[PDB]
Assembly symmetry: C6
Homo-oligomer: 159 residues x 6
């Protein structure tokens, strides 16, 4: 079950394919594509407007029919330079990412069955929690903290 | 969406346009114009009676009709020199800040649609929560932390995919 | 609104004129007058029995008719030498200050209108919370914390 | 009003009068007389079987008849020096202090009116909270914290201005 | 009242009489005798299978009939020195101690009257709450925290 | 009672017997044999895809019929080296552990009676609570914490003294 890096990769792929050089209205970042999950922390990232996805703690609760609900959290960070203005561009980026999370359907989902093929599925819901922002320190750079929760039912049932 | 920084910019513009060299009754600081969000912290600020607006964490919940309720927290700080007295001038400056934050209408918006023009919008309600004051240290200067919350309805960018 | 240094100065003035060299009954500290708000901390204060008023966190809540009720906090400190005994004199100090808090009316108050004159007003109610003291350290001196709350409605209404 | 120092003084006087070489039954410490609130901390105190009553933070609430309920906290500390066992004698002394605080009447006062005489008053009730015990370190010495709280009705110095 | 070191000594005597060289099969420890309250911390204890009793914080409640209830806590520690496996022998010891606490009756008790004789009494109930285990550090030795509560009404009533 | 080490040993025995070179469908990490409670921490463990079962604090309550409810916690940690990807391999291993927790039967015991034989018993239910992983530091290595709770009814060694 779990399928956590699957969630992360699905979100990254969705964001990349919905932001890359298309639909200039309703989306304003013009990312050639930089979003990923392998490279983060701060070191590396020599390119900017770069958005990284973290993978955090998840909590599960049991239903008495084999059903599984798994509340899982993806911390999100955004780094910006003074293209125009740090606060302005940062809010532009966070509005863009929140829009791409909310306005479009549910995530395509790319589980890997043991010694088989991928059975595409979906993720139930999205809830976006508190949104934070960097402080005055580190003036030329910027940070934007996003807390989003995902809940999915893994394609299995108990005994 | 979000409109955060747009909210802060509209609020600071309202402050500047409302407490500058006009209507000296019920409002007296005669700021040539100082308040902004671009420059803050403490370094710089050669001018005083300088009130600054910061950007804080949001909080959100979903209502089952496409509308989402979000609380914006704007911790705004007050800096002032000695003059006649730190306490009296500080409190009356924050009193002016609160009377302009409450008495005069609601907010305005100058939000920008993606690669388009700015369509005005509105902020639903504003509540000013706990307000603090600094201590004796740094005597000729002084801090005055006042925390405000903004309840705004973002444009419902659902049902239109 | 706010109007807090006026609250502090009103409390200081009330204590001073209600405790200075008059009514030997009820009150006895014979404070010729030391109480203030400009000078505190500990450094300076060469005179004793001195009582100082602090400035604390405020709290506000809204009523849906323009009415504003503002919870306020004034920590109070008292510093004493050995006239007879630290505990005894510090304690009848805190007793006298609590009595001047409680027994006499509401505040006579000195709010200041912008570019106008003072419209004397009233403060609704006062609640005295925990009263603390110091530790055995600093034997020749003494400290005693007082936590009071000023509950007032600012003389203004919303739109 | 408050009277917390007078409460401490009356309680220590009761301890001294009720432990000193009298009532050999039901009471076993034979304090010739040691207990006080004047000298405490640890430094000094060349005598032992010593018990010291600290006077601490309080709590209060308001009732709509002029009467005020005050919760006073009196941290009580005890000390011992071997002479058979730390644990047995510490238990013995804390048991004696607990039976004094419990089974013997109510609490007397010796409060002083403004520039007048002393009119006796009483404490409404006593309640004893957790009683801690120190650890092994400082082997020949020992501590056992006793947290007691009293509820007293102070003289209702309202309605008579 | 209080009667705390008497609780500790009664527990120690009970464990000694129900562990030593007799009643095997009921519980497993062939402990000749090591349990005590005078010697603890870690230093001393040259021998192993040591079990120690601590004396901890108690809480009391007052009933409006002179009745007295006292919620008292006795942390318990057990030490071991292999001869097989740390986890195996440690759970062996904790099972032994939980059995000796639970299976047999209430506590026989040896409270001491003022300048008189001992009036044996009873302890109402025992509840054993969370049981802990040490960390991998200090491999040749072992630790396991035992937390129990004893309920006793002291043989006296109020006025 | 307790059974903590016995529960852990039976759990890890089920892990090793179910992971090794069999049923490649639905289950693939191919632990030849490795995981146990004897060796853990980090020092040693030259072999990876290694998962450790620790023994943690428990919780208990009493019900008025002699039966004891004991809530026991097993912190489980996952270690993995880079083969194709740290994230993919760590996720798949934790998924395999979780499906061992869920889809396979109940938990067996091998508890030994005092100076007697081993009569097997069962575990009531398994609940797997929050599970977490490490961060970027120690890049070629990885950590994945698993917190699992086991509810067991210990043999009612009451009413038969």
């Amino acid at each position: 079950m779990d399928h956590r890096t699957s969630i992360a990769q699905a979100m990254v792929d969705r964001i990349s394919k919905q932001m890359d050089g298309s639909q200039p209205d309703e989306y304003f970042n013009n990312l050639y594509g930089n979003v990923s999950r392998q490279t983060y922390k701060f070191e590396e990232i020599r390119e900017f407007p770069y958005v990284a996805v973290h993978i955090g703690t998840e909590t599960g609760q049991y239903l008495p029919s084999g059903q599984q609900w798994m509340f899982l959290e993806l911390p999100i960070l955004v780094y910006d330079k003074e293209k125009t203005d740090i606060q302005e561009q940062l809010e532009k980026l966070v509005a863009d990412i929140k829009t791409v999370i909310d306005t479009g359907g549910n995530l395509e989902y790319t589980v890997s069955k043991p010694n088989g093929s991928t059975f595409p599925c979906e993720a139930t819901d999205m809830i976006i929690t508190s949104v934070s922002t960097d402080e005055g320190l580190l003036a030329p750079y910027g940070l934007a903290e996003i807390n989003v929760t995902v809940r999915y039912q893994p394609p299995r049932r108990s005994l």
